[PDB]
Amino acid sequence: SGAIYVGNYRVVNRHLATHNDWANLVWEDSSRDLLVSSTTAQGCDTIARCDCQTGVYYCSSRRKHYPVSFSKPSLIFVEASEYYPARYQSHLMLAVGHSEPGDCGGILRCQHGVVGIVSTGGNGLVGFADVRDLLWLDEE
Numbered sequence: 385s386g387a388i389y390v391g392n393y394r395v396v397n398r399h400l401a402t403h404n405d406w407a408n409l410v411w412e413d414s415s416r417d418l419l420v421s422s423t424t425a426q427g428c429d430t431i432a433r434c435d436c437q438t439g440v441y442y443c444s445s446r447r448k449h450y451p452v453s454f455s456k457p458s459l460i461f462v463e464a465s466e467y468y469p470a471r472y473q474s475h476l477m478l479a480v481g482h483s484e485p486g487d488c489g490g491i492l493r494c495q496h497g498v499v500g501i502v503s504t505g506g507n508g509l510v511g512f513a514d515v516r517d518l519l520w521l522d523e524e
């Protein structure tokens with residue numbers, strides 16, 4: 385589990401969104417595994433606006449933050465899981481690292497801010513849904 389809290393937005397994995405998220409929906413995209421809902425309180429996270437390929441992510445199944453090198457956002461075939469059939473996720477970045485399903489939501493960050501959230505994994509790879517192209521998270 386986990387979310388990004390920027391401005392009056394809450395960014396979560398679409399597959400982990402709650403009824404309150406869906407009842408206060410701003411935007412969702414199943415191909416990216418992302419959903420954004422509105423919040424009453426303002427958040428403290430800042431979104432990175434960059435092309436970094438190195439950063440640090442939180443792994444809840446290890447209670448640890450790990451430094452990683454990750455790929456540029458791309459269209460990756462991802463194997464079937466409990467929440468999705470086997471399909472080609474978009475805007476996904478891969479790194480070598482440990483993950484189990486409940487680590488979805490952990491933040492990946494660089495020197496500029498939040499880069500994305502854990503979305504997939506398997507065989508020692510972890511997959512992050514990028515948010516750096518969602519410029520509208522910075523306003524309104």
Ligand SMILES: CSc1ccccc1CC(=O)N1CCC[C@H]2C(=O)NC[C@H]21
Nearest residue numbers: 462463464465466483484485504505506
């Ligand atoms: C961070 S999500 C994760 C991490 C480690 C293991 C599994 C998951 C998610 C998950 O349920 N599956 C099904 C089993 C095969 C895996 C794969 O290659 N793609 C999806 C993935």
Ligand SMILES: [Zn+2]
Nearest residue numbers: 434436494496
């Ligand atoms: Zn950066």
